[PDB]
Amino acid sequence: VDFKLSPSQLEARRHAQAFANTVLTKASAEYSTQKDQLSRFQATRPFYREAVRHGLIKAQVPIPLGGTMESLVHESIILEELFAVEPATSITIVATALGLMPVILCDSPSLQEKFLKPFISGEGEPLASLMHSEPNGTANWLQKGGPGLQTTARKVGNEWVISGEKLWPSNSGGWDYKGADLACVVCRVSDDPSKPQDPNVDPATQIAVLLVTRETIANNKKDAYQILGEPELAGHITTSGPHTRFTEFHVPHENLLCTPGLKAQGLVETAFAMSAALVGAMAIGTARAAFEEALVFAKSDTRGGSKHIIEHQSVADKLIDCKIRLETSRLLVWKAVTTLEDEALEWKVKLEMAMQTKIYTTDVAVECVIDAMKAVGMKSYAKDMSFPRLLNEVMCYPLFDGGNIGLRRRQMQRVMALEDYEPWAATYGS
Template sequence: MVDFTLSSQQTALRNSARAFAQDVLLTAPSMYNDQPDQRSRFEATLPIYQQAVKAGLIKGQVPAPLGGTSTSIVDAAIVVEEFFAKEPSAAITILGTGLGLMPLILAGTPKQHEKFLTPFLGDEGEPIAAFVHSEPGGTANWLEKGAPGLNTTAYEQHGEWIINGEKLWTTNSSGWDQRGADLQCVVCRQSSPGSPQDLTSDPASQILILLVTREDVTKNDHSAYQILSDPELAGFKSAIGPHSRFTNFRVPASQLLCRPGEGAAIVEQTFGSSAALVGAMGVGIMRAAFEATLVFCKEDKRGGTVPIIQHQSVSDKLMDIKMKVESARMLTWKALSGIEKGPGNWENKLETALEAKIWCTDQAPKAVMDAMAAVGMKSYAKDMPFSRLLEDAICLPLFDGGNIGVRRRQLEKIFQRDGYEPWASTYI
């Protein structure tokens, strides 16, 4: 039987996440708002990140069997919602490390787990990780046969892999000092630099993933790893998604995470798990919009005789937002529970995760706009939360695989397969 009641442990987790969001994350804007650019705003949040490490929020994204404290990815959705209801921008940096570690968690050997996860299992410092996949030319069609494919290449020589190419929109990848995150999981195409992709082959057969550490950056020539720019973002004002370049960058052969032909599947699993968590981000933003609107509409008369919540048109907007929040939360929890427990195979689980990502993030900007319509012109003022919520909400359908360019097309392919069972992810 379906049960959405939180366990005592989950209730405690929610209370802890809510307290951290209220007491720590909410202080982030006062640290970064006056900074002149994206890089400065990101670096200004370092004390927030250090407190997150101390609070166990980094090792909380690593499964307990691997030394962390995570016991369920549904629990992760609970944390994400609480964070995004208060301060999405600083939260992205914390959660970006979890995404950065995911390929290692999924595909690492016991020896790689022990070596590369250990820095993220303590409660001191500021260890940060990144999943390094996207490129300046776009990656929506990276596995299309006959296309150029990934431009970041790697080839093996004398016990090392040598990386060449550029990456962009890779959250956290520069680290705090532009000399690299503590761990980058870098997705590459097996090839010597400048060699075009074989247009007759399956692009997935050439995809590999390498583990790159700050120590590797130090050992290479200074020019081998460069941050070219830090794009200014419309939302998530303190997050960082740098444009970076690898030039004859050398990595020990032991740091091959996925052999050629194995990397594409891990990329899909990484983005599959993250898809539903982005849905939870949408839940948090919609929740914040509803709560702020509810308070305003119960207190403000807008020059009339009664609080505006007593006008049907205003109440209807509140109802629409509330139903979006509840529906999005249930779909997100269902998707994440399905990834952990089933039913169905991986494709069935991926389908529901894609639905959660697409639907929840498409609803988030609409919910904020409904909130602004209910409040009226006052919602446009900077001392109200709505413009900030809208700036963050409009990013959600675009990142972590854009809903139009990537996620809906993934879902389309699933629907088109012979033997597709529409409800396999719901019923055994």
């Protein structure tokens, strides 16, 4: 057991810091003047372009697939540094990574060659999206006896026809609402969409994932793909994640990611478990910005007293708590991503670790931001400091990427209740 960083991992850190400082710091002056969520998102376009130019999109795809991703620890380091400065654009990079994951993870060399090509070119501003989330929710999408996903697909000849609405998927409508360069649309198979999911068939057996590109949307009637809305979010105000409606939206059979059923579900599960671990790095980045801002302040400001406020035990107690949360969180992320890369561990083991990581790091990040504000006091509440932005951004994390209460705690509970559950396999082996 070793925690030492390789030269390539310290370089990744240096590269991410340089990009965030020289590029991402200029973003706010552009997006802040815009009047709504989409406009703010479109204002980030030049910065994403610079991310592509800096090789950061290509770094979201494994080397075997023509990308430059060195490992998930490198990835975790990059994301922490990025989110400690500016989640605008940073969020777009990782949302694209997620949107690429089902293609990355499938075992279809032709699909990989064809659909990952734009993202490994180092050109343009291509966006990917994993379109899973829906207006009615998704915590219960696999509940046997329940309605299931409300975006459905049926096969008609050599094509699939998609019917229904998505809500929340990042980048899903692309820069201009004519679509992400690649969307992986997750559907429930239904020959007759006006009828309820069969309560006697396992929902996981009816899952399909269809690859939709801008070409696919262009080859369809205009009214077959409509953007109905764009949520105004409490924080991450520069992201896009619209409300989309599919109506008789035709997709070539060749665009079907794999055979419908447990394998399709598994691709979705694996993608979202990988994101569950990586989200920890984002949360640490945000909470670290908070902690660091409060630490610098506490060590340089006396608040009209005789000594720097760090010298008061209650203030120090808050900063200690912040520090501990960030330290424990990073260790857990690095544990989780390494666990996920370990070919000798069973899925159950990797999944459970990923669930722990998402739950802990996101819950604790919020406490860290809030405790940092309390320590600084009143001055943390005005927008000449980072905290108002950080407070809104940090509340995203426990809720998104499969919220802790409805999704991640349930996924974990399910593993723990299996007769063969081995709690310590990721540490002490089977």
